[PDB]
């Protein structure tokens, strides 16, 4: 839910940062994501290439 929320406001974030907290596994949460999105039919942007570099490069 927070992933899609941040995407609507194009706030940079990546899966790994979230999943480090939830005791999550790639199959589990990826399948759950597909299920929820196709259940609710919600539109959501993609990860823009330049969106993530700004925060990523500043982390060095």
């Amino acid at each position: 839910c927070v992933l899609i929320t941040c995407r609507q406001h194009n706030w940079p974030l990546t899966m790994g940062a979230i999943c480090t907290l939830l005791y999550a596994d790639l199959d589990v949460f990826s399948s759950t994501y597909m299920q929820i999105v196709k259940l609710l039919g919600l539109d959501v942007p993609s990860l823009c290439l330049a969106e993530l570099v700004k925060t990523y490069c500043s982390s060095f």
Partner: protein, 97 residues
Amino acid sequence: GSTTTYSSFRKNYYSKPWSNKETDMFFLAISMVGTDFSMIGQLFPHRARIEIKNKFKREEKTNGWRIDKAFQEKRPFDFDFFAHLLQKVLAEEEKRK
């Protein structure tokens, strides 16, 4: 710990490569057992049933003719004989190597 927690698909773990004499023994079991991958997995305790299915899938790509030829080269079935053959041939492979 750092925020740069890289994530990639790891289900492709390192499994032990299949030996040539092990493949010959797999074909022999096909001849002498059949395609019961569970009982083959018991015969090959080193290999679980999913590895047996994967071996079938890989071999049938080109060596399906050998699968059929083995399956028609039927033989009496004995678990103890197969176990002795497996261990003896592997030990002889080690000694030759």
